[PDB]
Amino acid sequence: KPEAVLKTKGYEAAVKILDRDHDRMVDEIIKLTEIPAPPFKEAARAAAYAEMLKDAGLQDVEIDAEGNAMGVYRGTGPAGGPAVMIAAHLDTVFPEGTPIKVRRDGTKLHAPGIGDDTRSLAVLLAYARAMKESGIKVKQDIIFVGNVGEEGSGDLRGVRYLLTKGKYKDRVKSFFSMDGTDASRIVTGGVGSKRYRITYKGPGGHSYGAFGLVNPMVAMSQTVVDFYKIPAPAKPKTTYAASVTGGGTSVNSIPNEVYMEFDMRSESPAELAKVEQAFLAIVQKSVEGENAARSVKEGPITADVKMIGDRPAGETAATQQIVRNADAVIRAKGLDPRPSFSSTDSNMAMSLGIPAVTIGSGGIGARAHSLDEWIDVKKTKSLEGATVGLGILLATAGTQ
Amino acid sequence: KPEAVLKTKGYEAAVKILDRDHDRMVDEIIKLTEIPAPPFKEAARAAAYAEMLKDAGLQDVEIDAEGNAMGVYRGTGPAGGPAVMIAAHLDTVFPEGTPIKVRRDGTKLHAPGIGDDTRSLAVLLAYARAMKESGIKVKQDIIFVGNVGEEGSGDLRGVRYLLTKGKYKDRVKSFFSMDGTDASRIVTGGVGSKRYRITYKGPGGHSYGAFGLVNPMVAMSQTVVDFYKIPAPAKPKTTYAASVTGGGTSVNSIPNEVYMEFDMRSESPAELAKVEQAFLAIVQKSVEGENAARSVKEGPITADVKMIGDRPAGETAATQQIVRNADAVIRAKGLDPRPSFSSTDSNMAMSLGIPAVTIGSGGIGARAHSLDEWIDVKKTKSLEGATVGLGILLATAGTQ
Ligand SMILES: [Gd+3]
Ligand SMILES: [Gd+3]
């Protein structure tokens, strides 16, 4: 029974430390939040986080080549065996120069990035300290990670490195991401997305004198028309959009360079690949069609295909033990686990066939990704919410 | 017989003054060229030109409400009778801030706008002076005009005012524009053009969460695709283009506003109108089709139709006396007249049923509308070329 961990003496002792040092945890939320971490600019926060992982007593603390900070809670099993990884991301959505100063308002704390995902960073440190102080023994090692690149164009670069290049790539057999404050959260699905800019070029020419030459505007417009005839099922949810366009200089000239940006997403890797392949075929057919319709005497239309965003789709089956563990603990805590799809760091693990769930840090929060983001650190709910992830984690690593 | 004007004592005496004061003409080319006159910013050059029109001895010199400068060479007929208008435009294609300093290079003068159309402004002043000094008597009044708005977005606003609103609008029965340096040119046809910006709007939305809503990008793309199936005759030459596009913010959203700029032109007013009506119908059908194919629950696609350019098409029949006069004088001057279509100030007069030709100022020039434009003012060729338009003009007004 996974929820039995909640009645073990070690868990109960660890919760009492989380309780005792909740004020330390809040101080660390504030400290980390005020070290800004825009996309691709996480190094300063990673350096501070690595020092805090060392101060929590973790072993082998280091920052890897991608910029992830990590430390190990060593278990009782053989060195190098299967391990559990739990990550909270260092980056926020907010660009460099965003003023970040926490404003206290009763038990509420207002600052960009404080809930997605800085609180989770502090919650994981609190776990590591409470586990060590209470003497918890786990069967599998736990790798605590502050990872880079969950947000925006980071495109999961940190977890991609952790799980395909880094020292733990062959050991992670259970992956958790702690993202956001909702501790009832159980993200078992990953929405994938593929994004492209298509730049169409042609010879150009005077719009009167050279009327009859190919026009890349038309190949581009034809692409959009056929793109919106691609079938898209309602379930698994599958979507696409023609979203941004530009090009041309004036009505005196046939354009020689124009572009369109396209989005495609799906809950299903198979549906996403199908849309992506249909799209790429449409781009090529639209170019061929323009070169057939008008004159290529001054040169043909060509298209440059540039990928501008890439996240895999995937899902952890509801019968997987990691999901069973999260479900059972969240239920035993009196919350309602409702499995959902999202686009989170767990998408990467899912795409590798690694069992993976994204969970929440606890408490109340709102307006994530907005300049008026805030969390409530009133102790009763903040502490109780933080105890949820600890139970899920220890159920999954196993305790002695 | 029209070229008999070239053997009249008055013409021969006038040419001798053009010769004697050819150096003044060159000085006035330079002076006027160095007063920049970008589109809509001709006022400074117009004021200088009006002072020069007074100094040439013309009567009733004034700047009209649109900004055209003009003066009258009074003929021997009744006041208020039919008149000849001859115009050279004050504006150039070059935007404000273009550095303009004439560079002398042997007998060449290099400066933006010096040939199209500043040399013509100085040539018309030289005619007015030489006619007065030699005592030329003409039957019809001649209205000498430095007009605004021939180039680009000016859209013939100057000649439009002169011939539809101004004080001479009902007296001009022959219209000449002197535009460019090629004195063998005889532009008897006017290519018309209509230019539009179509702005397509919709509600926007999250590109995943709101997938299924209408997208104005698709109505716009469909417009272009069907626009390029509009039939366009080769004779009378009829053309169109989809030339400039923009809109959208990122692949995370369905766009709420996008635009496309369209060109359409023809030698024939009727062919031009057919394309324009087919285009506007396609815009409406594309909006209707998008509102049928996707959801209007957050609001429908709409299209704002904005005309951004309008120049009428037309032609002066080769049997008109004004064309016979031009043809005969150009032949008698040893040049080869090949009547042609272009887009010039004469389009306006043509569209009003006023006999109209665009002619050249004489001499050699090149790279009109480019930053490296130049003319050659070597006297033999420059003077002989300038005498062509004088003969055409006097043949048309009549001399006694
Ligand atoms: Gd305390
Ligand atoms: Gd996040």
Ligand SMILES: [Gd+3]
């Ligand atoms: Gd011009």
